[PDB]
Coordinates of N, CA, C and O in Angstrom, one line a residue:
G1 N 11.1 -3.1 -12.9 CA 10.9 -3.5 -11.6 C 11.1 -4.9 -11.4 O 10.0 -5.7 -11.5
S2 N 12.2 -5.4 -11.1 CA 12.5 -6.9 -10.9 C 12.1 -7.3 -9.5 O 12.0 -6.5 -8.6
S3 N 11.7 -8.6 -9.3 CA 11.2 -9.1 -8.1 C 12.4 -9.9 -7.3 O 13.5 -10.0 -7.9
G4 N 12.1 -10.3 -6.1 CA 13.1 -10.9 -5.4 C 12.5 -11.9 -4.3 O 11.3 -12.3 -4.4
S5 N 13.3 -12.3 -3.3 CA 12.9 -13.2 -2.3 C 12.1 -12.4 -1.2 O 12.3 -11.2 -1.0
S6 N 11.1 -13.1 -0.5 CA 10.4 -12.4 0.5 C 11.2 -12.1 1.8 O 11.5 -13.0 2.6
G7 N 11.7 -10.9 1.8 CA 12.5 -10.4 2.9 C 11.7 -9.6 4.0 O 12.2 -8.6 4.4
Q8 N 10.5 -10.1 4.3 CA 9.7 -9.4 5.2 C 10.2 -9.5 6.6 O 11.2 -10.2 6.9
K9 N 9.7 -8.7 7.6 CA 10.2 -8.6 8.9 C 9.3 -9.7 9.8 O 9.9 -10.6 10.5
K10 N 8.0 -9.4 9.8 CA 7.1 -10.3 10.5 C 6.0 -10.8 9.6 O 5.4 -10.1 8.9
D11 N 5.8 -12.2 9.7 CA 4.7 -12.8 8.9 C 3.3 -12.2 9.2 O 2.8 -12.4 10.3
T12 N 2.8 -11.5 8.3 CA 1.5 -10.8 8.5 C 0.4 -11.8 8.8 O 0.3 -12.8 8.1
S13 N -0.4 -11.6 9.8 CA -1.4 -12.4 10.2 C -2.7 -12.3 9.4 O -3.7 -11.7 9.8
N14 N -2.6 -12.7 8.1 CA -3.8 -12.5 7.2 C -4.1 -11.1 7.0 O -5.3 -10.7 7.0
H15 N -3.1 -10.2 6.9 CA -3.3 -8.8 6.7 C -3.6 -8.5 5.2 O -3.5 -9.3 4.4
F16 N -4.0 -7.2 5.0 CA -4.4 -6.8 3.7 C -3.3 -5.8 3.1 O -3.0 -4.8 3.8
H17 N -2.7 -6.2 2.0 CA -1.7 -5.4 1.4 C -2.3 -4.3 0.5 O -3.0 -4.5 -0.4
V18 N -1.9 -3.0 0.8 CA -2.4 -1.9 0.0 C -1.3 -1.2 -0.7 O -0.3 -0.8 -0.2
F19 N -1.5 -1.2 -2.1 CA -0.6 -0.5 -3.0 C -0.7 1.0 -3.0 O -1.9 1.5 -3.0
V20 N 0.4 1.7 -3.0 CA 0.4 3.2 -3.0 C 1.4 3.7 -4.1 O 2.5 3.6 -3.9
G21 N 0.8 4.3 -5.1 CA 1.7 4.8 -6.2 C 1.8 6.4 -6.1 O 1.3 6.9 -5.1
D22 N 2.4 6.9 -7.1 CA 2.7 8.4 -7.1 C 3.2 8.9 -5.7 O 2.5 9.8 -5.1
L23 N 4.2 8.3 -5.2 CA 4.7 8.7 -3.8 C 5.8 9.7 -4.0 O 6.9 9.4 -4.3
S24 N 5.5 10.9 -3.8 CA 6.4 12.1 -3.8 C 7.8 11.6 -3.4 O 7.9 10.7 -2.6
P25 N 8.8 12.3 -3.9 CA 10.2 12.0 -3.5 C 10.5 12.4 -2.1 O 11.4 11.9 -1.4
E26 N 9.8 13.4 -1.6 CA 10.0 13.9 -0.2 C 9.4 13.0 0.8 O 9.7 13.1 2.0
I27 N 8.6 12.0 0.3 CA 8.0 11.1 1.2 C 9.0 10.2 1.8 O 10.1 10.0 1.4
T28 N 8.6 9.6 3.0 CA 9.5 8.7 3.7 C 8.8 7.6 4.4 O 7.6 7.8 4.9
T29 N 9.3 6.4 4.5 CA 8.8 5.2 5.1 C 8.1 5.6 6.4 O 7.0 5.1 6.7
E30 N 8.7 6.5 7.1 CA 8.2 6.9 8.4 C 7.0 7.8 8.2 O 6.0 7.7 9.0
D31 N 7.0 8.6 7.2 CA 5.9 9.4 6.9 C 4.6 8.7 6.6 O 3.5 8.9 7.2
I32 N 4.7 7.8 5.7 CA 3.6 6.9 5.3 C 3.0 6.2 6.5 O 1.7 6.1 6.6
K33 N 3.8 5.6 7.3 CA 3.4 4.9 8.5 C 2.6 5.7 9.4 O 1.7 5.3 10.0
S34 N 2.9 7.0 9.4 CA 2.2 8.0 10.2 C 1.1 8.7 9.5 O 0.2 9.3 10.0
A35 N 1.2 8.6 8.1 CA 0.2 9.3 7.3 C -1.0 8.3 7.0 O -2.0 8.8 6.5
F36 N -0.8 7.1 7.4 CA -1.8 6.1 7.2 C -2.3 5.5 8.6 O -3.3 4.8 8.7
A37 N -1.6 5.9 9.6 CA -2.0 5.5 11.0 C -3.5 5.9 11.3 O -4.2 5.1 11.8
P38 N -3.8 7.1 11.0 CA -5.2 7.7 11.3 C -6.2 6.7 10.8 O -7.4 6.8 11.2
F39 N -5.8 5.8 9.9 CA -6.8 4.8 9.4 C -6.9 3.5 10.3 O -7.9 3.0 10.6
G40 N -5.7 3.0 10.6 CA -5.6 1.8 11.4 C -4.2 1.4 11.8 O -3.2 2.0 11.3
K41 N -4.0 0.4 12.6 CA -2.7 -0.1 13.0 C -1.9 -0.6 11.8 O -2.4 -1.3 11.0
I42 N -0.7 -0.2 11.7 CA 0.2 -0.6 10.6 C 1.2 -1.7 11.0 O 1.8 -1.6 12.1
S43 N 1.2 -2.8 10.2 CA 2.1 -3.9 10.5 C 3.3 -3.9 9.6 O 4.5 -4.2 10.1
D44 N 3.1 -3.6 8.3 CA 4.2 -3.5 7.4 C 4.1 -2.4 6.4 O 3.0 -2.3 5.7
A45 N 5.0 -1.5 6.4 CA 5.0 -0.3 5.5 C 6.4 0.1 5.0 O 7.3 0.2 5.8
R46 N 6.6 0.3 3.7 CA 7.9 0.7 3.2 C 7.7 1.5 1.8 O 6.7 1.3 1.2
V47 N 8.6 2.3 1.5 CA 8.6 3.1 0.3 C 9.7 2.7 -0.6 O 10.9 3.2 -0.4
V48 N 9.4 1.9 -1.6 CA 10.4 1.5 -2.6 C 11.2 2.7 -3.1 O 10.7 3.5 -3.8
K49 N 12.5 2.7 -2.8 CA 13.4 3.8 -3.3 C 14.4 3.3 -4.2 O 14.9 2.1 -4.1
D50 N 15.0 4.2 -5.1 CA 16.1 3.8 -6.0 C 17.3 3.5 -5.2 O 17.6 4.1 -4.2
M51 N 18.2 2.6 -5.7 CA 19.5 2.3 -5.1 C 20.6 3.2 -5.7 O 21.7 3.2 -5.1
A52 N 20.3 4.0 -6.7 CA 21.2 4.8 -7.3 C 21.1 6.2 -6.8 O 22.1 6.8 -6.2
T53 N 19.9 6.8 -7.0 CA 19.7 8.2 -6.6 C 19.2 8.2 -5.1 O 19.5 9.1 -4.3
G54 N 18.4 7.2 -4.7 CA 17.8 7.1 -3.4 C 16.6 8.0 -3.2 O 16.4 8.6 -2.1
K55 N 15.8 8.1 -4.2 CA 14.5 8.9 -4.2 C 13.3 8.0 -4.4 O 13.3 7.1 -5.2
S56 N 12.3 8.3 -3.6 CA 11.0 7.5 -3.7 C 10.7 7.2 -5.2 O 10.3 8.1 -5.9
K57 N 10.9 6.0 -5.6 CA 10.7 5.6 -7.0 C 9.3 6.1 -7.4 O 9.1 6.4 -8.6
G58 N 8.3 6.0 -6.5 CA 7.0 6.5 -6.8 C 5.9 5.5 -6.5 O 4.8 5.5 -7.1
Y59 N 6.2 4.5 -5.6 CA 5.3 3.4 -5.3 C 5.8 2.8 -4.0 O 7.0 2.5 -3.8
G60 N 4.8 2.3 -3.2 CA 5.1 1.6 -2.0 C 4.1 0.6 -1.5 O 3.1 0.4 -2.3
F61 N 4.2 0.1 -0.3 CA 3.3 -0.9 0.1 C 2.9 -0.6 1.6 O 3.8 -0.2 2.4
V62 N 1.6 -0.8 1.9 CA 1.1 -0.4 3.3 C 0.1 -1.5 3.7 O -1.1 -1.5 3.2
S63 N 0.5 -2.4 4.6 CA -0.4 -3.5 5.0 C -1.3 -3.0 6.3 O -0.8 -2.1 7.0
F64 N -2.4 -3.6 6.4 CA -3.3 -3.1 7.5 C -3.8 -4.4 8.3 O -4.0 -5.4 7.7
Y65 N -4.0 -4.3 9.6 CA -4.4 -5.3 10.5 C -5.8 -5.9 10.0 O -6.0 -7.1 10.0
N66 N -6.7 -4.9 9.7 CA -8.0 -5.3 9.1 C -8.3 -4.7 7.8 O -7.4 -4.0 7.2
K67 N -9.5 -5.1 7.2 CA -9.8 -4.6 5.9 C -10.4 -3.2 6.0 O -10.0 -2.3 5.3
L68 N -11.4 -3.0 6.8 CA -12.1 -1.7 6.9 C -11.1 -0.6 7.0 O -11.1 0.4 6.2
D69 N -10.2 -0.8 7.9 CA -9.1 0.2 8.1 C -8.4 0.5 6.8 O -8.2 1.7 6.5
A70 N -8.1 -0.4 6.0 CA -7.4 -0.3 4.8 C -8.3 0.5 3.8 O -7.8 1.4 3.2
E71 N -9.5 0.0 3.7 CA -10.4 0.7 2.7 C -10.5 2.2 3.0 O -10.4 3.0 2.0
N72 N -10.4 2.6 4.3 CA -10.5 4.0 4.7 C -9.4 4.8 4.0 O -9.6 5.8 3.4
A73 N -8.2 4.2 4.0 CA -7.0 4.9 3.5 C -7.1 4.8 1.9 O -7.0 5.9 1.2
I74 N -7.4 3.7 1.3 CA -7.5 3.5 -0.1 C -8.3 4.6 -0.7 O -8.0 5.1 -1.7
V75 N -9.4 5.0 0.0 CA -10.3 6.0 -0.5 C -9.8 7.4 -0.1 O -9.6 8.2 -0.9
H76 N -9.6 7.6 1.3 CA -9.1 8.8 1.8 C -7.8 9.2 1.1 O -7.7 10.2 0.4
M77 N -6.7 8.4 1.4 CA -5.4 8.7 0.8 C -5.5 8.8 -0.7 O -4.9 9.6 -1.3
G78 N -6.3 7.9 -1.3 CA -6.4 7.8 -2.8 C -6.4 9.3 -3.4 O -7.5 9.9 -3.5
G79 N -5.2 9.7 -3.8 CA -5.1 11.0 -4.4 C -4.8 12.1 -3.3 O -4.2 13.1 -3.7
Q80 N -5.2 11.9 -2.1 CA -4.9 12.8 -1.1 C -3.6 13.5 -1.2 O -2.6 12.8 -1.7
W81 N -3.4 14.7 -0.8 CA -2.1 15.4 -0.9 C -1.3 15.2 0.4 O -1.4 15.9 1.4
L82 N -0.5 14.1 0.4 CA 0.4 13.8 1.5 C 1.7 14.6 1.4 O 2.0 15.5 2.3
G83 N 2.6 14.2 0.5 CA 3.9 14.8 0.3 C 4.0 15.4 -1.0 O 4.0 14.8 -2.0
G84 N 4.2 16.8 -1.1 CA 4.3 17.5 -2.3 C 3.2 17.2 -3.3 O 2.2 17.8 -3.3
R85 N 3.5 16.2 -4.1 CA 2.5 15.7 -5.1 C 1.4 14.8 -4.5 O 1.6 14.4 -3.3
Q86 N 0.5 14.5 -5.3 CA -0.6 13.6 -4.9 C -0.1 12.1 -4.8 O 1.0 11.8 -5.2
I87 N -1.0 11.2 -4.3 CA -0.7 9.8 -4.2 C -1.8 8.9 -4.7 O -3.0 9.4 -4.8
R88 N -1.5 7.7 -5.0 CA -2.5 6.7 -5.5 C -2.7 5.6 -4.5 O -1.8 5.3 -3.7
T89 N -3.8 4.8 -4.7 CA -4.0 3.7 -3.8 C -4.8 2.6 -4.6 O -5.7 2.9 -5.3
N90 N -4.5 1.3 -4.3 CA -5.2 0.2 -4.9 C -5.0 -1.1 -4.1 O -4.0 -1.2 -3.3
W91 N -5.7 -2.1 -4.5 CA -5.6 -3.4 -3.8 C -4.6 -4.2 -4.4 O -4.9 -5.1 -5.3
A92 N -3.3 -4.0 -4.0 CA -2.2 -4.8 -4.6 C -2.6 -6.3 -4.7 O -2.2 -6.9 -5.7
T93 N -3.3 -6.8 -3.8 CA -3.7 -8.2 -3.8 C -4.7 -8.5 -5.0 O -5.6 -7.7 -5.3
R94 N -4.4 -9.6 -5.7 CA -5.3 -10.0 -6.8 C -5.9 -11.3 -6.6 O -5.3 -12.3 -6.1
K95 N -7.2 -11.4 -7.0 CA -8.0 -12.6 -6.8 C -8.4 -13.1 -8.2 O -8.8 -12.4 -9.0
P96 N -8.4 -14.5 -8.4 CA -8.8 -15.1 -9.6 C -10.3 -15.1 -9.8 O -11.1 -15.1 -8.9
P97 N -10.7 -14.8 -11.1 CA -12.2 -14.7 -11.5 C -12.9 -16.1 -11.3 O -12.3 -17.1 -11.6
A98 N -14.1 -16.0 -10.8 CA -14.9 -17.2 -10.6 C -15.5 -17.7 -12.0 O -15.7 -17.0 -12.9
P99 N -15.5 -19.1 -12.1 CA -16.0 -19.8 -13.3 C -17.5 -19.6 -13.5 O -18.2 -18.9 -12.8
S100 N -17.9 -20.1 -14.7 CA -19.4 -20.0 -15.0 C -20.0 -21.4 -15.3 O -19.3 -22.4 -15.3
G101 N -21.3 -21.4 -15.5 CA -22.0 -22.6 -15.8 C -23.0 -22.5 -17.0 O -24.2 -22.5 -16.7
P102 N -22.4 -22.3 -18.2 CA -23.3 -22.2 -19.4 C -24.1 -23.5 -19.7 O -23.8 -24.6 -19.1
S103 N -25.0 -23.4 -20.6 CA -25.7 -24.6 -21.1 C -26.5 -24.3 -22.4 O -27.2 -23.3 -22.5
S104 N -26.4 -25.2 -23.4 CA -27.1 -25.0 -24.6 C -27.3 -26.4 -25.3 O -26.7 -27.3 -24.9
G105 N -28.1 -26.3 -26.4 CA -28.4 -27.6 -27.1 C -29.8 -27.9 -27.1 O -30.6 -27.8 -26.1

């Protein structure tokens, strides 16, 4: 999975990016957008598909206007049976660990 340039549509206003794996092949960008709507307003959602076969690689991204709304899906959708097979959910966003303040001598 190679990376590229940020080709987004609209600059998310401090939204939360939610990762979704195990995305059945029958799934569709439109499906996810409507399958996660029940949680909250969707700003950016897409299902990474192969350029050769054209089938849901098995992972996508779903941003949310707020956090709470996102959490709802991450838990609800997490494993939920959307399309054919089950699906996964995680906080694509990564944060650096906080330092410490030891002392001895």
